[PDB]
Symmetry: C2
Subunit: 339 residues, 2 copies
Amino acid sequence: TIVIGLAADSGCGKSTFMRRLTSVFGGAAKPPKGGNPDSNTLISDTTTVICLDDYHSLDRYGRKEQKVTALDPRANDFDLMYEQVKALKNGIAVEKPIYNHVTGLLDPPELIQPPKILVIEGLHPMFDERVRDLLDFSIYLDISNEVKFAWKIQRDMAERGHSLESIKASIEARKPDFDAFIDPQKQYADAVIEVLPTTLIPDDNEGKVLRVRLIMKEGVKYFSPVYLFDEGSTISWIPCGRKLTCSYPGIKFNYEPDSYFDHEVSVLEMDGQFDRLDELIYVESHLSNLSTKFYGEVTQQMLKHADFPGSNNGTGLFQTIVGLKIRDLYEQLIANKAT
Amino acid sequence: TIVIGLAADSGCGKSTFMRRLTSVFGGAAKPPKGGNPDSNTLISDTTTVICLDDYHSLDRYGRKEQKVTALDPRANDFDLMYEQVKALKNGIAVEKPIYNHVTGLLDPPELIQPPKILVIEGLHPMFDERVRDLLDFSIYLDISNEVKFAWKIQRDMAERGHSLESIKASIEARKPDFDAFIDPQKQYADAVIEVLPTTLIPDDNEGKVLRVRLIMKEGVKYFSPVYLFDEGSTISWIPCGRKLTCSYPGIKFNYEPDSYFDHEVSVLEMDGQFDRLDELIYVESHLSNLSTKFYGEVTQQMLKHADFPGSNNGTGLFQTIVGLKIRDLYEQLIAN
């Protein structure tokens, strides 16, 4: 966990995901103080987060000239990505270009010092074999089209597009290269958080109530997947729940082993949204392999960030658990010395 | 004394059910040492089982000629039944008639001494309020009518010979009476074992694999129901596996609260069959409030009678567990 990789698409609350992760690690998540104001980087005393947009080879206007998207590998310089995170992993400060999302250009570099924990997040952290050989853990955030577009209506890119406050051409121009080049990276993730429309009730295009699968890879050295009641078995669990007033659809947990890109995985799934902070502390209490340090830490960490999107559903619950898992992987890896 | 009531239709495994209960409470249960070859009583060290046909008010012919069936409350004497169950509970011996099942006649009575555990088994154990109040715990062995027909067309009298086939008289006899006086007694049981067609393999009604539900009543003083993992929640559970390994039909468990006659119950459901009895000890190791005094006790009981029918499915499993939860109740009452 000296180097983490988070594959996720723009506008999927990866921002919110990054902040839950950082807080478990060291809680600061602030951009560099005196440089470019349009820097994508975040810094804490323990972790530094790098947006892989900064390794675009082609700027916005150049990408248009060649009529390739930010998702094209042609649009991204992977050789430089590889050498730079290889340098950051080995204690070497690096001169990192800055992709300016506002003006669309590749601006003068940022000087990145080598962090205790390095997170590279964006479209291609698992795309290139050389780079994932550097990663000690990898995450993929899978937002299905329905939930993506549902967030893309108001809330996320708030009905601002051009034709019916919809630039929806974007999704239909990006998705070809997205399914060609981004989605196949799921295969290399130790943890996938998959967000889908709810099996419970009829909502969307508002979203809000979600079926969130947490796919965890078995057989990866310091990662024991969380399980519910009996590991290896197939389980449904409706925690209701006298303490539980919840809810309009309620919450239903699911647990089952599965094979995922012909990798054996365990899947924990939560449908619906919880509610009382005394009633999600119930939920934590019946999961195991939460790799927490003390009782209630999942809820503690969730309560701290009680402001956050997805803080009432599996999106925040699983993102918070993934963070604790990765810190476990840290405390292990930071422990392996010395002679 | 502790008095139990076993509501059952015969041909539905009340006999087998019964032998699983007695094994939990005490020794072998055999007819009276001395008199009447065709008695229906069964005595053990601790438990006495009275078949309730012995309280018939009309014999086979009288019942026939008076145009009623065994299930008719008019063909039964609930006063005597009440007075004798009440006497046996209070430690008073009792001159209890005998319905001879071969000849269909009410033989002279037999003297029944009062046991520690009295078990009245038959059609109307909880029909009568005064009888009902004497029961410390009560059981209904329900068979879905879909299963019943399937059990008739293979077990009771499959073909019944002579080219054809089944009897209209058979189903078109007591089915009206059953649903009017028997079936409504489910409301009063603290524990109900309901047996229905299986979800797992689509059949019209084969009858080998079953879906068994054990409906238990919350609120009973000394009765803490069985639960799966997290009491009072709704849970579905396939113990296979991918860790446990099962055969062409899996096993599948369901645990949930429900409303039974507008009474609040917790239901435990087993679907499928235990092919290799290493899944039984797994399943037991995960259930809760089994009223075991030692772990694996349900298992040991089940294999001790491994050729009791229904040992490989939820029938034997739940009847065994019900037996244990009565022994718990038994020991609490005694224990002040």
